[PDB]
Amino acid sequence: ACGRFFQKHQGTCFYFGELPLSLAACTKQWDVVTYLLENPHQPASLEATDSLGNTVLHALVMIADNSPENSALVIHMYDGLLQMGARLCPTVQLEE
Amino acid sequence: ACGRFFQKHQGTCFYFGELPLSLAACTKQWDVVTYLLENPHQPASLEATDSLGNTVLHALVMIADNSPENSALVIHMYDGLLQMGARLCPTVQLEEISNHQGLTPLKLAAKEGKIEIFRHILQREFSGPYQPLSRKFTEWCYGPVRVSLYDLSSVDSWEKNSVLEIIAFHCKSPNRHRMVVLEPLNKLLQEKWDRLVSRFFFNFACYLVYMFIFTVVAYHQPSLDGESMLLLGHILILLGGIYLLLGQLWYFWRRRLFIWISFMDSYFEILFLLQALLTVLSQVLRFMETEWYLPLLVLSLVLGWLNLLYYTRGFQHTGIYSVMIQKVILRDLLRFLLVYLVFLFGFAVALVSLSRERSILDASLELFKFTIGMGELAFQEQLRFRGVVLLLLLAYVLLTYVLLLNMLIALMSETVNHVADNSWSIWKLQKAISVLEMENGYWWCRRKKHREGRLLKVGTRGDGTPDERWCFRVEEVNWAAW
Amino acid sequence: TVLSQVLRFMETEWYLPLLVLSLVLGWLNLLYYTRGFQHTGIYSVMIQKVILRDLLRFLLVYLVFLFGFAVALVSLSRERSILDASLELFKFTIGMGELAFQEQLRFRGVVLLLLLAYVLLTYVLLLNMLIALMSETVNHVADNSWSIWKLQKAISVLEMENG
């Protein structure tokens, strides 16, 4: 889901990762992030690349900033994505 | 109910608004304020004018002050007066009524530097859902992180009496910049300064680049008499003063020759008048015969080259430093010269009197050797009381260092008395003060004036029947629960 | 360094005049390594970096003032070599202003009351930079440039392993 607002251009934007799970990190919910993987009809994946060939974890750091409250919740999501990740894809190394 | 105590005169007073509902705001009760309108026998009105043609809302801001607890309760009353007002008089617009001088209350809130309502008054959260016709001064559409929007009541430069009309010119400023640092007026700096800083540089070019070649006359100048380039200089020496004469004169035509109250930093504006005025001294001698032209046009060239310091402005930050120091040291320069120079009168007399064994102003240069200092110190014994003048001059080595010191440390005290982002913002004031002339154009006669096509995006989103406003779109990034 | 080499046998002549600067800046740039043998450097690059911005802002303000006054000096003293006559004004830069008052110019008070205007503003031109510096240290740095000492070291580590 790429466009003007979804591109990383200066102003009128934020480069969240241009796909459903990518903004699901930015939503700070941690409830649908599990279900959009757990969904039996069509499961998502962190393997899903974007316009710069990234997983969601590259967008987490770009969307991360110098706001302690934002980094605190970002950290909480970030750590648990590896717990949900490594459980469901133990064959794949995730931060490489 | 007007009198001595109820008049706005200095001391023994407070100008609450001279009628029952006016002090009812100052009573901080909010219970009788409803009933004195709800009373069925004789209802009051905010329409009730006073000695300066004001509603109660003009008195709220005058009675408001730099007390947070007072402004907090003042804000609470102030917002609900519009809820009780607009309900009972929806036909009447409430914050657009002018005083006897012709001034609105939201504009008049800037006049006296009201701190702590004034930020609130711009930034208000109560129209949707319960007064959708009031319009907030705020709006929002399309947020994952909020794309905000602020309206425009009168604060944009060109609308005939904004706060930009008074905060630039008629500012009675306890200190300004903060009132300007709030987001809708603060952000407005760059929205047009993008379009104006290039034209500022284009006009700054025309200020300084012709002052450069104004000098090369004096380079080629003869004392007594393709060489027409030297003679051509005179035609631009005419323009050297005459351009900056009219230009700075018609500034006072629109400033009506306003009184010395704006002494703060309008001395920089009249530093152009110095060059403008002093250029003519040579012109109207110079053909005629009178002779004092080359001697005194020195100062016309001097102060002109000096006043090119003024524009140490916005091409880099530094200026946040420039005017911070330059303004406060103009007070120090006054205090410096008043103390120092008057010491050495009687000692130049003591020098010439002891050295006996109208031209003493030139003999005072003997003492001004040590000002830099390069004190001669040359000891001789022809004076026959050798120790008098010798033990005299050693007294000034300590106090001359002290006379630097006390000013060096009077300065230390000015920086020990910390300024966080005060003069850092005065950089933007100096820019936003310099915005005054940008939209108006040039009775300089490049184009005799310039019009206005610099207004902001049409709101066209309000509640029925009047749906229309002028507004501006702002960006934000917030990290709350939602 | 090469400017001298490939003149020097040949004949061209501007070699000893301009190799001065090759020797100068080389000896100057030995300041760079005020680094890690003692701490001090936590000071060195903190000031040296921020004053490179101050040095730019200093020279842009000051030097351009004295052009028209060197013209005012030579113009009033009438009664391409003025760049050398500007040294008369650069006497007061250090300052060791001559101040030598004579009355052959026939409007004695012009140039005499001119030069007294610069004693105050020359101190101000030092002052405002002295205090623009005060502002840079009033704006406290706790262990920022103290750590940039280690950055400058860890930046200098880039070339060590490569050979």
UniProtKB/Swiss-Prot annotation, chain C:
Transmembrane segments: 14-34, 56-76, 111-131
Expression sites (tissue/organ): Ubiquitously expressed. Expressed in dorsal root ganglia, trigeminal ganglia, spinal cord (Lissauer's tract, dorsal horn and dorsal columns) (at protein level).
Highest taxon in the source lineage: Eukaryota
Source species taxonomy: Eukaryota, Metazoa, Chordata, Craniata, Vertebrata
Cytoplasmic side: 35-55
PTM description: N-glycosylated.
Role of this protein: Calcium-permeable, non-selective cation channel with an outward rectification. Seems to be regulated, at least in part, by growth factors, like IGF1, PDGF and morphogenetic neuropeptide/head activator. May transduce physical stimuli in mast cells. Activated by temperatures higher than 52 degrees Celsius; is not activated by vanilloids and acidic pH.
Organism: Rattus norvegicus (Rat)
Family: Belongs to the transient receptor (TC 1.A.4) family. TrpV subfamily. TRPV2 sub-subfamily.
Extracellular topological domain: 1-13
Subunit architecture: Homotetramer. Interacts with a cAMP-dependent protein kinase type II regulatory subunit (PRKAR2A or PRKAR2B) and ACBD3. Interacts with SLC50A1; the interaction probably occurs intracellularly and depends on TRPV2 N-glycosylation.
Intracellular or extracellular location(s): Cell membrane; Cytoplasm; Melanosome
Protein name, as recorded: Transient receptor potential cation channel subfamily V member 2
